[PDB]
Design a protein around this ligand. Structure first.
Ligand SMILES: C[C@H](O)C1CCN(c2nccnc2Oc2ccc(Nc3nc4ccccc4s3)cc2)CC1
Ligand SMILES: C[C@H](O)C1CCN(c2nccnc2Oc2ccc(Nc3nc4ccccc4s3)cc2)CC1
Ligand SMILES: C[C@H](O)C1CCN(c2nccnc2Oc2ccc(Nc3nc4ccccc4s3)cc2)CC1
Ligand SMILES: [Zn+2]
Ligand SMILES: [Zn+2]
Ligand SMILES: [Zn+2]
Ligand SMILES: [Zn+2]
Ligand SMILES: [Zn+2]
Ligand SMILES: [Zn+2]
Lengths: 318, 318, 318
């Protein structure tokens, strides 16, 4: 049968990639046509060779790729990078997650920024974009999930077709919650609740609501993972991020609204201090809380701390 | 019937867009997939819901879009922007124009730079491009009109199919003259004639030759309308214009010809003075004459004057 | 018949292009859709109007174009430029080459960088790319030839279909050797052997192994021909080359490897001295040896010397 042939086969990568893909700070490289294979490899190792039908999975991946836009940061490369960070978390916390969760989270990460224009929720609201009229909160994130469902509804694209309806509904809910959690506006309240539950010892992974929160923080950790790469990667990625932000700032100016210094290209000299404030307020607390809950995710925090030190070095002019 | 269903329907935009689209200094935004709807909205309001068959119009618009190139300035965004300026002129001078003229001028504006490579007529002549051998004068503009006719000749693309042959020939002549008028080389003689006719009182909109001249000036006013936007928009658009000019200057250097300082990237520091000279010699007289002939177009002149003041501020280093 | 209609026809270019295409320092221009016609013109003049079936040749050219990537330097424009340099060599040494060689070399030049990603053989080895596992030496070049054969194998794409199998095998070997020779790592040993054979007088174009070496040097000369253009062209092309090199340097840094100063964007100030060293060590000896073997190729050396003088002028700050 088809599933019998797939069970005998094993998908493989080049030697360097096979070894280094297990590291949290792995970079997927500049060869775009290798990314689909990298994702399939990660799915096969974290879930199994029988989790998805290979022909359907490949069809799904290519359609997801087609629905990411040619923008500096929120692009196809970001999607696969976020998926890799989730893979590394999953592999280092392997006993904790169900088959459905491992299936759902990797797919959620791949789809989490689908059809991103490179503009924030704030900008879409101020422009009065039709999406803002449809989705009052988490505007882009609700759209990302809508795009995901639409791709799944295409003929030959339902990668969850072998699942029961019950399991199908469960995995789609996992995906929905995970994608919505990537709205950074929701992260601050989530992390604060998680910190309190951890300190009191009330935090329980057997409680679904608690489990959803931890998954939410995992999604934030994967989404921001550029700060957990080695310095050369982190610094170069920052160029892509600001390219998008400054473009939005330009568009804000076109609306007759003065943008925040973060999005203002006239204030390039304040970037090192701006990054310092981001690491202190957002990045460090995120990976600190995640390391407390899931100790094997420690390398993410260490790398984040190392990059914080690098930004301090830039400020001093060293 | 089909026209009966279209009569009952009404096309609408978001609240902010509906209000601000009436302003001369309106910016169409960075969301490309909203531009077709913006154009249809303008056609529906200025001409009527029964002017074009909606399915044919949408098919036409998408083909026009496909025939604009990925260049910094002379692109799809420019086409819709020029069309909007015409819409604002039409709406503020509503009693003056026939149904054919309102139909023709919006379409002429949308099509006026079709298949633009980002090079001037001068460059094509010096390169010895096949287009220069076919069209001795107004090389690109004659090509733009040829592209327009070719798109109209495609199956299901004749948006003027319900018109009589007489009316069809009239609208195509309106379109031809309007597009040819966007050759800035022809503007100087046109404006000079219009100024004389206005001052003597011989200018008569009931005279076809006079009417053609006024339409010609309207086309120039719409074409140069980036100088009538608010300062942030005007300044950012200037970056796109010079990107094209400097690229042409590079190509001129490749032919062994020293380009004019306007097209020379080595003379970036002279841009503010170069803009000052352009406003004084071309932009201000254009909108002054247009305001004299059509007083409701006054906001274009005011905004042009405001931008002239801004460039003077740049020169002083303020 | 079809070949009879083709014999009566003659393909022509604009006046300036017809005259200046014969010069070694000719630039093909910024009009992409003119390049296919330029190539066909060169084939018709150097080989003949009966060398290729026009419909098949055009189909081949467009497929080759489709298989070049949107990279700053190793792109479709480079391919046609390299082909032109070969045309100029062929036309100025017309009595030396067979019909098969003239056919093969122009096609080899057009196909010599097929599917180039903008990365060196060194980078692919260090990244551990699948291509490096398949091709241990001349990694990209062996791939370029593989792409060439694949395009030829497509239905209606065999431009050599009228040739006997014997002649077909001969032309494919000419193409293979020519493309492999564009590996600059192989140039140094080739030029050294050619210099020795020329000085002793053992060099004999009637000897196939010697002939292969001369063709190899011709390929190097055509590949590096940007240094033989006029200064404005040479200087602007250098921007495209470094764009690719610095991108590779960035990727090297992402692997945790410090790139050589050539590929390091942090060392932009050393470019003029870096170019000086390249002209002295690689470019000048290449065209000197080629001029010794084929004296009509002298204009390439003169132009290379002129550009060397220009780089020296940059260093002095003049
Ligand atoms: C919007 C998305 O969810 C993500 C949001 C966070 N993100 C970033 N990741 C790593 C580094 N930087 C990221 O975005 C920024 C987050 C914060 C800043 N902060 C500031 N930057 C500046 C720069 C100049 C002047 C003031 C400021 S304040 C700048 C960029 C990636 C995109
Ligand atoms: C060719 C098209 O019909 C249009 C021509 C006019 N156009 C412009 N609109 C707004 C602002 N600038 C436009 O183009 C220019 C028109 C004039 C100049 N003038 C000069 N600019 C410089 C810059 C440096 C040194 C000397 C000079 S002279 C520069 C640009 C948009 C394109
Ligand atoms: C890889 C391909 O076969 C070709 C290799 C040679 N090539 C060039 N042609 C003309 C000019 N430059 C070319 O590539 C270079 C060849 C040598 C250098 N040399 C150096 N450049 C620098 C710059 C800064 C610091 C040190 C150095 S050393 C730079 C670029 C075109 C591409
Ligand atoms: Zn997002
Ligand atoms: Zn994201
Ligand atoms: Zn134009
Ligand atoms: Zn225009
Ligand atoms: Zn090559
Ligand atoms: Zn090459």
């Amino acid at each position: 049968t088809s599933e019998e042939w797939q069970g005998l086969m094993q998908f493989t990568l080049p030697v360097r990639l096979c070894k280094e893909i297990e590291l949290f700070h792995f970079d997927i490289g500049p060869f775009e046509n290798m990314w689909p294979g990298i994702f399939v490899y990660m799915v096969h190792r974290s879930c199994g060779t029988s989790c998805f039908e290979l022909e359907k999975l490949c069809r799904f991946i290519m359609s997801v790729k087609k629905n990411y836009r040619r923008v500096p940061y929120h692009n196809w490369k970001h999607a696969v990078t976020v998926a890799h960070c989730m893979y590394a978390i999953l592999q280092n916390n392997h006993t904790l997650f169900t088959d459905l969760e491992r299936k759902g989270l990797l797919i959620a990460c791949l789809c989490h920024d689908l059809d991103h224009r490179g503009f924030s929720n704030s900008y879409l609201q101020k422009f009065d974009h039709p999406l803002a009229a449809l989705y009052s909160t988490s505007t882009m994130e609700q759209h990302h999930f809508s795009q995901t469902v639409s791709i799944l509804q295409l003929e030959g694209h339902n990668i969850f077709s072998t699942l029961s309806s019950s399991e199908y509904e469960q995995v789609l809910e996992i995906i929905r919650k995970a994608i919505i959690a990537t709205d950074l506006a929701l992260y601050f309240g989530n992390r604060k609740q998680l910190e309190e539950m951890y300190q009191t010892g009330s935090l329980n992974l057997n409680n679904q609501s608690h489990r959803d929160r931890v998954i939410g923080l995992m999604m934030t950790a994967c989404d921001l993972c550029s700060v957990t790469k080695l310095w050369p990667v982190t610094k170069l990625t920052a160029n892509d991020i600001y390219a998008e932000f400054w473009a939005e700032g330009d568009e804000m100016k076109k609306l007759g609204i003065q943008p925040i210094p973060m999005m203002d290209r006239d204030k390039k000299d304040e970037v090192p201090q701006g990054q310092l404030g981001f690491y202190n307020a957002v990045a460090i607390p995120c990976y600190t809380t995640l390391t407390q809950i899931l100790p094997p995710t420690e390398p993410l925090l260490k790398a984040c701390r190392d990059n914080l030190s690098q930004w301090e070095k830039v400020i001093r002019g060293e």
